[PDB]
Amino acid sequence: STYVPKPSRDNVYRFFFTEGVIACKKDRMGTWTGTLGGNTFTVPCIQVMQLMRSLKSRNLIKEQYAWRHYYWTLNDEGIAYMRSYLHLAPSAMPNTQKP
Amino acid sequence: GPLSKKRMIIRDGVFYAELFEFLKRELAEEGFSGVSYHVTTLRTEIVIKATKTREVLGVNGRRIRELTACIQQRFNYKEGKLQLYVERVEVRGLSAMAQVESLRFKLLSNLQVRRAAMGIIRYVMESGAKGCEVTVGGKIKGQRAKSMTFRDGYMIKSGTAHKSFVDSACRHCYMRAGCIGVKVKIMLPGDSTGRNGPSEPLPDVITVIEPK
Amino acid sequence: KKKKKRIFTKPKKPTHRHKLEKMRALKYFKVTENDDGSYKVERT
Amino acid sequence: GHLDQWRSRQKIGMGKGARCCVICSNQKALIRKYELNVCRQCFRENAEHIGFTKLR
Amino acid sequence: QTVRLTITSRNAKAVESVTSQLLTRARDEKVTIHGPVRLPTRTLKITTRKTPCGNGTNTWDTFELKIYKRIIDLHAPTEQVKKITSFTMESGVDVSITILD
RNA sequence: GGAACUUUACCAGAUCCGGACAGGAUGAGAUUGACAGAUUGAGUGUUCUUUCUCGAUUCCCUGAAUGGUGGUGCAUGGCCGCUUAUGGUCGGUGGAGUGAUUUGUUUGGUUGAUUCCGUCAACGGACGAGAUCCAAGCUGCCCAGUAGAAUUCAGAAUUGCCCAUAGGAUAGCGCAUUCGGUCGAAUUCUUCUCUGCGGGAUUCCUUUGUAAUUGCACAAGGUGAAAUUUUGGGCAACAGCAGGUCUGUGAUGCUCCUCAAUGUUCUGGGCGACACGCGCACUACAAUGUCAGUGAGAACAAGAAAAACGAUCGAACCUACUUGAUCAAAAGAGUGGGGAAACCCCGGAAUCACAUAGACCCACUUGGGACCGAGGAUUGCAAUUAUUGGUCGCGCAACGAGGAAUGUCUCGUAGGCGCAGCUCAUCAAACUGUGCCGAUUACGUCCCU
Ligand SMILES: [K+]
Ligand SMILES: [K+]
Ligand SMILES: [Mg+2]
Ligand SMILES: [Mg+2]
Ligand SMILES: [Mg+2]
Ligand SMILES: [Mg+2]
Ligand SMILES: [Mg+2]
Ligand SMILES: [Mg+2]
Ligand SMILES: [Mg+2]
Ligand SMILES: [Mg+2]
Ligand SMILES: [Mg+2]
Ligand SMILES: [Mg+2]
Ligand SMILES: [Mg+2]
Ligand SMILES: [Mg+2]
Ligand SMILES: [Mg+2]
Ligand SMILES: [Mg+2]
Ligand SMILES: [Mg+2]
Ligand SMILES: [Mg+2]
Ligand SMILES: [Mg+2]
Ligand SMILES: [Mg+2]
Ligand SMILES: [Mg+2]
Ligand SMILES: [Mg+2]
Ligand SMILES: [Mg+2]
Ligand SMILES: [Mg+2]
Ligand SMILES: [Mg+2]
Ligand SMILES: [Mg+2]
Ligand SMILES: [Mg+2]
Ligand code: NA
Ligand code: NA
Ligand SMILES: [Zn+2]
């Protein structure tokens, strides 16, 4: 099912902002695991792909595919969107952007 | 428990093939020319060879850090166990990958096949290559597809020594009419150090030393 | 592979529509008027 | 419901329907030797990178 | 105690360079050396049809992968052995350390 | 491409949205999911009755998008096959033609070779051929507690008069042999095994040979592990074919379908269906045999797992031994080992051998084992259209050497013989390799193609 729960969406978005990229295998029957700092949270792979499709169609991320694996990277528009969606403090950066 | 030697060697080779494909697609715009890695007990030290080094790095290494994150999550590398380096190609005219990518960009910018191909050949021979061959195929003129080949200099084709003296690369160009294939073959000169050449001379060349 | 103009025998099954119960939670609690003047509530 | 019925057979994970190429995701002519799990067509284009060399 | 070093690689030149480097460094320590044994070379063989569509003469491509293995036995403490194998190894060479009994 | 489901593209039906996003209409109740009852092939909320649950993720319709083993290989990329196993191919400058074009690249001898020598309006070049590369034979250094050997101690075994039921032929005539469980120690060593770089062969040596009458070479023999591309492979030019593949890919243009779908799942069926024709195999028609015994004996190779699941390992994989066994096979169990020169393994393969004093005796017969019956076990979620082994029946199935035609092949080859890998949960009459036993014929020709 592609009915993504809101808490699952926020956890994926929070992981996406912290580490600027998300890598997920292309399999409908699968699970994606993200560290999100402390603890570990798992989201179905089909639901992760559904969330990234919306961002891709909104020109908020860059998508790369190779060997059954997705590679999504937030661009400047996505980083600004992620900051506003999560209400992150201004001048908060992903680990890639961070010094 | 521990993987056998045959399984470990296969696992390393499959990892390199996937890493090669990922970097080939991600750094197509830059002059990606190859990748090497050296796994130690502490880190992995992946090294990326490119001509347009500054763009693969990005602003304060933003793009290279994004590449590190992609490789880290894909292969489940722990924190601090993976490091990425980028080094410029010493001679970009002797790299078939750099030239076939340059040819691909020129063709995609609506440039004449004859002008684009001879530009690659002229540049490659100006870099010291003994020979260069460029092939372009597909629907160039109309509905019917032709293959055009432009060559200059030396080129060996048979035997196995041509796999160390000739650098070859092929790419797909997606134009409006369909797909176009471009190939670049470069005959490398013999560098004594063996850096950008196979060091040893041609297998069928005999040189008589001048008496002192 | 082409459309063969399938002729169905059974009627077309409709799609499920979630029936809306206007203020459903209003009837999950009963308001009992207290002697003081307020009301009391309990789960039903 | 339908969620339990969805992809039930594929969840068993038995037969050629459960295996696929690690590159092309295709389920035809899979090379399972040494746990390569690569299609025979994809193997030819990636043999040199994996380490296999064509001699004799 | 006896420490065994196992050297395995796909490249014959790299596996010989690392093995000789370990032998030279161990000789400088004046430790007892059990000469580098050349284990049998194992070849991985994959034979596939050349065509991607099954048309024409059934021609085949034989792909081979060779694995080279060497072992050296050291009569030295693990501290001495550790600093013997502490140089810049060639890429593609795997050195494993085990303690015999 | 050895399809039970899956795969799967086909057929009969049922779900799912995996129609992003944008613009509008609903909306804190947008919506999601459901027990029971019946709908149904479904102890499938698919839908309904009836209720709760979830909650701004979604539903509604408009454009759009997406996926497709949908079309078109006569729109294409890439790859492969074939023209084409042979010796072929093209510039520059110069010569010759009004020009296409030609010369070079021709002719004689030689070579598998446009390989060489000579000649020569050509001269200089570039590819292919050759070389290179990988295996196989001889050999050097290196090397072993994942390979072996020889000696020395102790420990056990045979031990001399022996003549088979009829008992031949076949080495022996300072110290007699034997025991990988005797899992006994010790010492020494690299003949055998392992291999990263080397060595070694080249027409090198010899003919009152051939030829030369320069040369390039050739034929016999010698040397030698190997005597002519050493052997076997890999690679392999330039021009092409409307050859094959859109059923390998997130390789692709255009085009088609797109919410009761040609997308995608799930259930069942089919891809296996038989008056018949054809290609390629397997098994045979028996005595140079079939059975029942016994002996000695290869090589290439394969082997177990997650960011899961359990308490850094342990369980998947392959095996030995034991047990079942106080009574068939196939099984089923227990224990141990192996990441693979370490366990399997001293790899007891099958052709083969046996003076086995074994059975059969020329017959569709103890040849052949198609077809079918009954019990039982095993793989799997599922075995009916027998999945596959094993047991006993069936053998009274054709077949007694195959018309016209026709394939492949020159030495460790053909043919015969098994083994491993590959497909693989289960299933090789297939393929890819491997070793074993090992010939007849030719050493030519251009008659056929
Ligand atoms: K031709
Ligand atoms: K003829
Ligand atoms: Mg050749
Ligand atoms: Mg089958
Ligand atoms: Mg089905
Ligand atoms: Mg089926
Ligand atoms: Mg429903
Ligand atoms: Mg389909
Ligand atoms: Mg064609
Ligand atoms: Mg084509
Ligand atoms: Mg001229
Ligand atoms: Mg001319
Ligand atoms: Mg000519
Ligand atoms: Mg001749
Ligand atoms: Mg000639
Ligand atoms: Mg061609
Ligand atoms: Mg055609
Ligand atoms: Mg198409
Ligand atoms: Mg395809
Ligand atoms: Mg299409
Ligand atoms: Mg449908
Ligand atoms: Mg079929
Ligand atoms: Mg036919
Ligand atoms: Mg016999
Ligand atoms: Mg008979
Ligand atoms: Mg013929
Ligand atoms: Mg087959
Ligand atoms: Na060929
Ligand atoms: Na029987
Ligand atoms: Zn593939």
Q: How crowded is the C-beta side of A82, counted as CA atoms within 13 Å?
A: 30
User: Which one, of C19, E98, D13, B63, lies nearest residue A97 by Cα?
Assistant: B63
Domain's final residue, options B52, B73, B90: B90
Q: Which helix (H) or strand (E) holds B12?
A: helix B5-26
Cα R_g (chain D), whole angstroms = 15
Residue type, B164: S
What span, in angstroms and rounded, lies between the C-alpha atoms of A72 and B163?
Answer: 37
Domain's final residue, options B64, B90, B116: B90
Domain holding D24, by residue range, is 3-56
Q: Are residues B62 and B12 in the same domain?
A: yes
User: Taking a C-beta distance cutoff of 8 angstroms, is the pair D28, E40 a contact?
Assistant: no
**β-pairing verdict for B46-50 and B84-88:** parallel
**β-pairing verdict for B166-174 and C39-43:** unpaired
User: Which one, of C25, D51, B62, B22, lies nearest residue A67 by Cα?
Assistant: B22
Nucleotide nearest to B6 (CA to C1'): F339
Per-residue CA distances from A21 to B72, B73, B83, E94 (Å) = 10, 9, 16, 31
The owner of tokens 């001879």 is B118
Strands (E), B19-100: 34-37, 46-50, 84-88
Contact yes or no for A29 and D7 at CB 8 A: yes
Per-residue CA distances from D54 to B24, B188, D32, E47, E67 (Å) = 23, 22, 19, 10, 15
Q: Are residues B101 and B83 in the same domain?
A: no
Q: Are residues B83 and B107 in the same domain?
A: no
Q: Are residues B47 and B111 in the same domain?
A: no
Q: Are residues B108 and B208 in the same domain?
A: yes
DSSP code string of C1-39: --------SSPPPPPP-----TTGGGGSEEEEE-SSSSE
Per-residue CA distances from B132 to A26, A32, B154, B183, B186 (Å) = 40, 47, 7, 10, 4
What's the N-to-C CA distance of chain A in angstroms? 39
Domain's final residue, options B53, B70, B90: B90
What's the N-to-C CA distance of chain D in angstroms? 58
Contact yes or no for A68 and D23 at CB 8 A: yes
Kindly provide the resolution of this structure in angstroms, with one decimal: 2.5
User: Which one, of A39, A34, A37, lies nearest residue A9 by Cα?
Assistant: A34
Strands (E), E1-101: 3-9, 32-38, 42-49, 60-75, 93-99
What span, in angstroms and rounded, lies between the C-alpha atoms of D26 and D41?
Answer: 10
The DSSP output letter for A88 is: P
Q: Which residues of chain A does D7 touch, with a Cβ-Cβ cutoff of 8 Å?
A: 28-29
Q: Could you tell me the distance, in angstroms and rounded to a whole number, from the CA of residue E43 to the centre of ligand 13?
A: 50
Question: Of chain E residues 5-64, which have a CB less than 8 A from chain B?
Answer: 8, 10, 42, 44
SS3 of residue A50 by DSSP: helix
Q: Are residues B4 and B72 in the same domain?
A: yes
Per-residue CA distances from C26 to A26, A43, A49, E82 (Å) = 46, 35, 39, 76
Nearest C-alpha of chain B: how many angstroms from E86?
A: 11
Nucleotide nearest to A28 (CA to C1'): F18
List chain F nucleotides near protein: any atom < 7 Å from a Cβ: 1, 5-10, 13-18, 20-22, 29-35, 42, 44-53, 55-60, 68-71, 75-82, 126-135, 142-146, 194-197, 232-239, 242-245, 247-254, 256-258, 260-262, 265-267, 301-305, 307, 313-314, 339-341, 380-382, 421-425, 431-433
User: Which one, of B169, A7, D42, lies nearest residue E63 by Cα?
Assistant: D42
Q: Are residues B85 and B98 in the same domain?
A: no
β-strand partners of E3: E74, E99
Nearest C-alpha of chain D: how many angstroms from B209?
A: 33
Q: How crowded is the C-beta side of D23, counted as CA atoms within 13 Å?
A: 25
- Torsion-angle region of B187 (φ positive above 0: left; ψ -120 to 50: alpha; else: beta): beta
State the Cα angle at C33 between C27 and C35, rounded to 5°: 165
The DSSP output letter for B111 is: -
> What CATH number corresponds to the domain at position D13?
4.10.830.10
| Whether A29 contacts chain D with CB within 8 A | yes
Residues near B133 by Cβ (< 8 Å), separated by ≥ 6? Answer: B149, B150, B151, B152, B155, B183, B184, B185, B186
Question: Of chain E residues 68-97, which have a CB less than 8 A from chain D?
Answer: none
Q: Which helix (H) or strand (E) holds B64?
A: helix B62-75
β-strand partners of B186: B132, B167
User: Taking a C-beta distance cutoff of 8 angstroms, is the pair B45, A76 a contact?
Assistant: no
Per-residue CA distances from B17 to B35, B36, B179, B198, D48 (Å) = 10, 11, 24, 23, 9
Query: Of the ligands numbered here, which is closest to the C-alpha atom of D39?
Result: 30
Contact yes or no for D33 and E46 at CB 8 A: yes
Q: Are residues B193 and B144 in the same domain?
A: yes
Q: Are residues B148 and B51 in the same domain?
A: no
Distance B159 CA to F234 C1' (A): 8
φ and ψ at B32, to 5 degrees? -60, 125
Give the chain A residue nearest B20 (alpha carbons): A66
β-strand partners of E94: E8
**β-pairing verdict for D30-31 and D38-39:** antiparallel
Give the chain B residue nearest A33 (alpha carbons): B73
> What CATH number corresponds to the domain at position B2?
3.30.300.20
Q: Are residues B97 and B197 in the same domain?
A: yes
Q: Which helix (H) or strand (E) holds A84?
A: helix A76-85
Residue type, B112: Q
| Whether B70 contacts chain A with CB within 8 A | yes
Strands (E), chain B: 34-37, 46-50, 84-88, 131-138, 146-153, 166-174, 179-187
Residue type, B11: R
- Torsion-angle region of A97 (φ positive above 0: left; ψ -120 to 50: alpha; else: beta): alpha
What are the contacts of D39-43 at 24+ separation with CB within 8 A? D40/E48, D40/E49, D41/E52, D43/E46, D43/E48, D43/E63
Instruction: Calculate the dihedral angle through the C-alpha atoms of B55, B59, B65, B66, rounding to the nearest 10 degrees.
Output: -70
- Split into its structural domains, chain D has a count of 1
What span, in angstroms and rounded, lies between the C-alpha atoms of E101 and E97?
Answer: 13
SS3 of residue B169 by DSSP: strand
Using CA of residue A92, residue A95, residue A96, residue A98, what is the dihedral sign?
A: positive
Nucleotide nearest to E60 (CA to C1'): F432
**β-pairing verdict for B146-153 and B46-50:** unpaired
Q: Could you tell me the distance, in angstroms and rounded to a whole number, from the CA of residue D16 to the centre of ligand 4?
A: 12
Kindly report which amino acid residue has its CA closest to the C1' atom of nucleotide F251: B172
User: Taking a C-beta distance cutoff of 8 angstroms, is the pair B189, B128 a contact?
Assistant: yes
Burial B130-146 (b: 16+ CB within 10 A, else e): bbbbbbbbbebeeeeee
Q: Are residues B189 and B101 in the same domain?
A: yes
**Residue of A28, A29, A67 lying closest to D23 (CB–CB):** A67
The tokens for B93 are 């005219």
**Residue of A1, A28, A67 lying closest to D22 (CB–CB):** A67
β-strand partners of E33: E74
Domain holding B205, by residue range, is 91-212
Q: Which residues of chain A does D3 touch, with a Cβ-Cβ cutoff of 8 Å?
A: 1
What span, in angstroms and rounded, lies between the C-alpha atoms of E75 and E94?
Answer: 21
Using CA of residue D43, residue D48, residue D50, residue D56, what is the dihedral sign?
A: positive
β-strand partners of B68: none
φ and ψ at D48, to 5 degrees? -65, -35
The tokens for A93 are 């950066």
Q: Are residues B17 and B76 in the same domain?
A: yes
The tokens for B10 are 């296969």
Contact yes or no for E65 and D40 at CB 8 A: no
What span, in angstroms and rounded, lies between the C-alpha atoms of C3 and C43?
Answer: 56
φ and ψ at E11, to 5 degrees? -100, 125
**Residue of D36, D46, D49 lying closest to B10 (CB–CB):** D36
φ and ψ at E93, to 5 degrees? -115, 130
What span, in angstroms and rounded, lies between the C-alpha atoms of D41 and C37?
Answer: 84
- Split into its structural domains, chain B has a count of 2
User: Taking a C-beta distance cutoff of 8 angstroms, is the pair D38, D31 a contact?
Assistant: yes
